[PDB]
Amino acid sequence: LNTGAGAANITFNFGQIAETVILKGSVPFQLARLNQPMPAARFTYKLRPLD
Amino acid sequence: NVNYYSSFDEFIISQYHAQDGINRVSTCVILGLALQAYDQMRRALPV
């Protein structure tokens, strides 16, 4: 939950051991790797934790 | 989109008095022999 002035950035660390992680959200959201441009809002993401 | 004629005599002459009349008449003659076969067959076998 965000109660500040503007949009915030949350860092997720899933480790390096798991093969795939699937992220689903209640509402569409944006996720991207560190120091990379953000994409349009989607519902589900598939990620490799070693990324 | 076709015309109707009272007889084959009017039909064959009208096509003759038209552009490419010679080619038209050749087709109309074949239709005539076909119509003659149709008359004999249908009179023999009414449906």
């Binding site: - | 989109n1 038209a18 552009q19 490419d20 080619n23 038209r24």
Partner: protein
């Protein structure tokens, strides 16, 4: 889906040959695919862009800033005409100023077309022997080629007959009225709640109702050049007399329809607009398009349905639409047309009359199987939206034969009954609207929004700004063709001249078949009541002992800026004469050859003024009385 054998006869049964062959496929980038017609209504790019060009032409010729600046002067001039109560035009009313703007622009284009027809008739009569030679000798050639030969053998001053040539030589007063430009930035919806104060009326007098706004936004005028009319006239003419009769017959019909178009705005009802219905899926296996044409300048509409390769049409009356359906009763049938088809609706403005649209529809229905679907749609949409004649010469010839038939006395549509009935429907609608508005709001408010002054286009007392390009010895001549008249009664003509000089003398002459009048005046910035006429039931006038159907009024003035001619009927709602036909026009004959004669004000003398006949003058020098 078809191949032909080499070294075979090139003749084919069909007279109209499609650019795409029987295979119905044209390789893109070839010459045949380049000369194919383009869909203007269906294509969004071409329809969007076409409106841009038409808007530019209207704005370049008529400027909104200029019209608003001349409102004050026009109001003063219209007040200078001392008109009986219940007959004055008060330009301070917002609604009355609007109808004058539409009427003035529409009348000027119609008036200019009549002038061009008059010179054309003069040139044809001058070369009777050679005109009759061309008409009789050549009959197998195309109508366009015959029209070119006729315009070459005469001093037509406009030799080109193509659409590009017609647009190249066209005056500023001919360009059609573009409705949306007139109604731009104009107040709508003044709310005065139970206030009869003089200030409350003044602000309400300054606005218009929303119904008038819709009418203007769906208004476009049609004016047919005499060069386009010559092809239907010369397609079956055997003599110059027959050809002149056809030319006058067509313009009489165009005269009546143009008057009807203006009355639609005056009545106080929303005029419908033409539209096209296309299927939702652009890449559809089964293709169908529907065109519903609602000509504002006319009395009969047309619905054209093209289902696959089959073309069907229906002509319907634009009067009597009491029910919820827009279409009235159908007068001519050409198949079954379904107006309930669901799809995208695209609105367009036609630039051809109902007769011309109907003429092409019959021609396309004759050649439904010979032409491909793209050619049928392209030719139809080009003519309706651009007034562009098809490139297919064989198709063009068939259209003009049908155009002649719908105009001639053997027409399947009896136009006089429908034109008369539309007039009765319009006046009944105006009466119903006025009394309906009389109950809802006050009688003063009703007169503000729906005025009873205007009525028909030529019944209404309108002004025609004149343009002068010929100057002789410092005196510029301004021309104005008096007549013909569609109504009978007493009619007055006035002239207003503004010039830079503090004092000046300007001369006005009126040419008949016998001689001129030679009035001389010196007043400025005020109408002068130049000449007064009376018109018979048949539309003829006994001017100085001779029956006349039209006169030429010429105004000479030095260092002038603007010359305006005003016109007003004595009684409101002058009754209309019967529209002339081919028989009426060839029954009687008048000579307009005398209209080109002009005088030199600089060399005029006192004894020269007055009514003088041609015998008094010598050969040439129509200014000096001594022979």
């Amino acid at each position: 889906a078809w191949v032909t054998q080499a070294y075979s006869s090139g003749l084919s049964q069909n007279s109209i040959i499609s650019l795409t062959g029987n295979d119905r496929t044209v390789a893109d980038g070839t010459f045949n695919s380049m000369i194919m017609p383009r869909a203007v209504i269906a294509n969004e790019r071409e329809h969007f862009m076409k409106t841009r060009i038409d808007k530019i032409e209207h704005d370049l010729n008529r400027s909104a800033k200029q019209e608003m600046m001349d409102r004050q002067s026009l109001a003063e001039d219209y007040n200078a005409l001392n008109l009986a109560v219940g007959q004055e035009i008060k330009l301070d009313i917002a609604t009355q100023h609007q109808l004058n703007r539409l009427g003035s622009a529409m009348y000027k284009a119609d008036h200019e077309r009549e002038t061009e027809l008059t010179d054309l008739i003069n040139r044809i009569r001058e070369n009777e022997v050679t005109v009759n030679g061309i008409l009789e000798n050549q009959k197998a050639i195309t109508a366009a080629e015959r029209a070119d030969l006729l315009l070459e053998v005469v001093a037509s001053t406009a030799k080109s007959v193509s659409a590009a040539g017609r647009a190249a030589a066209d005056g500023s007063g001919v360009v059609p009225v573009f409705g949306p430009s007139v109604a731009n930035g104009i107040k709508v919806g003044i709310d005065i709640a139970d206030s009869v104060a003089e200030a409350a009326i003044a602000v309400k007098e300054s606005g218009i109702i929303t119904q008038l706004n819709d009418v203007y936004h769906a208004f476009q005028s049609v004016h047919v050049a005499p060069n386009d009319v010559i092809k239907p006239a010369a397609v079956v003419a055997g003599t110059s007399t027959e050809l002149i009769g056809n030319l006058q017959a067509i313009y009489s019909r165009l005269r009546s329809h143009s008057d009807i178009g203006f009355k639609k705005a005056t009545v106080g009802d929303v005029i419908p607009n033409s539209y096209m219905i296309k299927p939702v899926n652009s890449t559809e296996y089964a293709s169908w398009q529907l065109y519903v044409i609602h000509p504002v300048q006319g009395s009969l509409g047309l619905v054209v349905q093209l289902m696959g390769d089959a073309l069907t049409y229906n002509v319907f009356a634009q009067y009597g639409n009491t029910s919820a359906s827009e279409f009235g009763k159908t007068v001519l049938t050409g198949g079954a047309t379904n107006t309930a088809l669901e799809g995208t609706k695209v609105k367009f403005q036609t630039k051809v009359t109902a007769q011309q649209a109907l003429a092409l529809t019959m021609a396309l229905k004759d050649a439904a199987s010979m032409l491909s679907q793209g050619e049928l749609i392209g030719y139809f949409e080009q003519y309706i939206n651009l007034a562009l004649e098809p490139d297919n010469l064989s198709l063009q010839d068939n259209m003009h034969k049908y155009h002649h038939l719908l105009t001639s006395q053997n027409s399947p549509i009896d136009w006089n009954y429908h034109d008369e009935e539309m007039h009765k429907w319009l006046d009944s609608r105006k009466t119903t609207n006025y009394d309906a508005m009389q109950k809802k709001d006050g009688t003063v408010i009703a007169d503000i929004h729906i005025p009873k002054v205007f009525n028909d286009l030529r019944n209404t007392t309108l002004h025609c700004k004149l343009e002068g390009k010929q100057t002789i010895a410092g005196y510029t001549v301004y021309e104005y063709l008096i007549g013909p008249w569609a109504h009978y009664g007493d009619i007055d003509y006035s002239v207003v001249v503004d010039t830079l000089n503090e004092e000046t003398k300007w001369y006005c002459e009126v040419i008949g078949i016998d001689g001129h009048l030679l009035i001389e005046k010196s007043v400025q910035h005020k109408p002068e009541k130049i000449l007064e006429l009376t018109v018979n039931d048949s539309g003829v006038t006994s001017f100085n002992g001779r029956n006349h159907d039209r006169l030429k009024l010429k105004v000479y003035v030095k260092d002038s800026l603007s010359v305006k001619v005003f016109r007003n009927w004595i009684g409101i709602n002058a009754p209309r004469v019967k529209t002339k036909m081919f028989n009426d026009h060839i029954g009687v004959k008048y000579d307009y050859s005398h209209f080109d004669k002009n005088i030199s004000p600089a060399h005029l003398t006192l004894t020269d003024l007055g009514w003088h006949t041609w015998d008094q003058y010598n050969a040439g020098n129509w200014t000096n009385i001594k022979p």
